[PDB]
Design a protein around this ligand. Structure first.
Ligand SMILES: CC[C@@](O)(C(=O)Nc1cnccc1C)c1cccc(Cl)c1
Ligand SMILES: CC[C@@](O)(C(=O)Nc1cnccc1C)c1cccc(Cl)c1
Lengths: 304, 304
């Protein structure tokens, strides 16, 4: 029993972190096989960041300008290329600690673990959700760029995020491992709007099921609702509209607890309309949306 | 910017986890050098747990009865001994992945990362605080016994906790790595009282400083208080009394923010007396107490 915001064990990712330096800029890189992946803004000075022409900037760089260090050993750079907003530095040595891996582009509302790094060294690990507006609410300081997000399925690491920037609002933006930004963001020091964020409804329902499984049941009521009635309330409270696809993914939790998804929606409706009245759910005084239905099943069943 | 409940990178600990089986009971063990540490209740059947005589139970066991498996390779057991509530199984091979380590007994209110494991395999990592009543609010299911808590200082892992049991209340109890329980708990399936828990006042103040550093300032007020006036409020709200030792540890955060510790105490006093009025602090609708002043400095400065 108990329910925590749990991150994946970070060992397989720690073995891939390297430090990348170009000129006077240092950030993190990800060494998988004989390639090091890092944000392309490693080639910029602070002055370049205001309006960088990455193609022109990269042309003044040669393989020997990219200094890649793994722990205390230097990697020899034999190739360099830009793919979208990431640089791929071909090295002469395959990372001996390369885990089985995939590059995946996650959907908004999905969760992942972040291994925050500075100078190629891991500082901590935490669990994040990609917001519906494609930002992440992380914990990152200058130098954390190149830190990655990932999920693990048995022995396979699916890398889904690489950190690139902090918006003036204090929220974070980054790319998939092909260098494609999540959201409308560009890798330039200019004010950029993150659209309206919404609460991930399917995750809140999943977390309500986790609460029932662990004994926190005070919010269960004698009511039910319909998908259309519930979505009228979701719209009013800036919650994502719930679809039959979301109900279908909640199926296993509905089966295990015997609480129909629409009955849980009616509990969520009353919580939105009346608040928590000074009470808590799983040690939280607000509705938590950074646990997917998959996360709830995994944590509640001890998947390793 | 941003502030997250961050755990230490778990790689160094993942390399130490093993599976220990004795009879029909399987749990986790910690392999450091040529010794495997695990909860002594690995020698019990469910029937023994009601009132075990560990000395008598261990006498019916020989080295060959303890099956220790690291990944897929079997370790040869050449010695066994009981120290308090842990078993130490001497093996013929030193763990090649043994990190630099220490065994430490933490104080209540201190924090640590837990690597939850099942069958010797890591499932997740999360950050915990040892409650003032010496319980932890973890996420553990049957089979998680032997999972450990730890802190890391550069390359040194200080192991501080080994999981042993879940109390009937759903909270968790365990030992230091010498097998000494934190709190009054015994390793027996009998109802056991965890005393009154209190909120870790110095940690809440540290988290309030983290909030100010990250821009959440609405709770700062025009008031101040004294240690004695503040402690009258702390007693009324089941908060730990604040001492000059606690004020001294908050010194660096007071210096960085320019907010005197007693002025932050007056902000905390008003929050306790008036609540949050439907507002949040660092994405929380309650006062968070599982970040120490050390954690706040480390996270806010990017220590790796
Ligand atoms: C220092 C600026 C920047 O490197 C950044 O946001 N870094 C940064 C990242 N995370 C947290 C804090 C900081 C400071 C920057 C700014 C705009 C665009 C891009 Cl691609 C990069
Ligand atoms: C199954 C009982 C027990 O192994 C336990 O609490 N395990 C357990 C641990 N964490 C979470 C869930 C479970 C179930 C037990 C009970 C009393 C005393 C002791 Cl030393 C051990």
């Amino acid at each position: 029993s108990g329910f925590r915001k749990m991150a994946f064990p970070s060992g397989k990712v720690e073995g891939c972190m390297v430090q990348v330096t170009c000129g006077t800029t240092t950030l993190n890189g990800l060494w998988l096989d004989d390639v090091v992946y890092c944000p392309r803004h490693v080639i910029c000075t602070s002055e370049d960041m205001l309006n960088p022409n990455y193609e022109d900037l990269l042309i003044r760089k040669s393989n020997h300008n990219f200094l890649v260090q793994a722990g205390n050993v230097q990697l020899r750079v034999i190739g360099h290329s830009m793919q979208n907003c990431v640089l791929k530095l071909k090295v002469d040595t395959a990372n001996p600690k390369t885990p089985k891996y995939k590059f995946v582009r996650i959907q908004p509302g999905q969760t992942f673990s972040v291994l925050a790094c500075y100078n190629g060294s891991p500082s901590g690990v935490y669990q994040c959700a990609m917001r519906p507006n494609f930002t992440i609410k992380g914990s990152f300081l200058n130098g954390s760029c190149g830190s990655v997000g990932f999920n693990i399925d048995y022995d396979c690491v699916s890398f889904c995020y690489m950190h690139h920037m902090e918006l003036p609002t204090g929220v974070h933006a980054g790319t998939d491992l092909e260098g494609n930004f999540y959201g409308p963001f560009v890798d330039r020091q200019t004010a950029q709007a993150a659209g309206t964020d919404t609460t991930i409804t399917v995750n809140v329902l999943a977390w309500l099921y986790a609460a029932v499984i662990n004994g926190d049941r005070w919010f269960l009521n004698r009511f039910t609702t319909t998908l259309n009635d519930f979505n009228l309330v979701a719209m009013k409270y800036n919650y994502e509209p719930l679809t039959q696809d979301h109900v279908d993914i909640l199926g296993p939790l509905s089966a295990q607890t015997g609480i129909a998804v629409l009955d849980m929606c009616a509990s969520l409706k009353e919580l939105l309309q009346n608040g928590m009245n000074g009470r808590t759910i799983l040690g939280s005084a607000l509705l938590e949306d950074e646990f997917t239905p998959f996360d709830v099943v995994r944590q509640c069943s001890g998947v390793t």
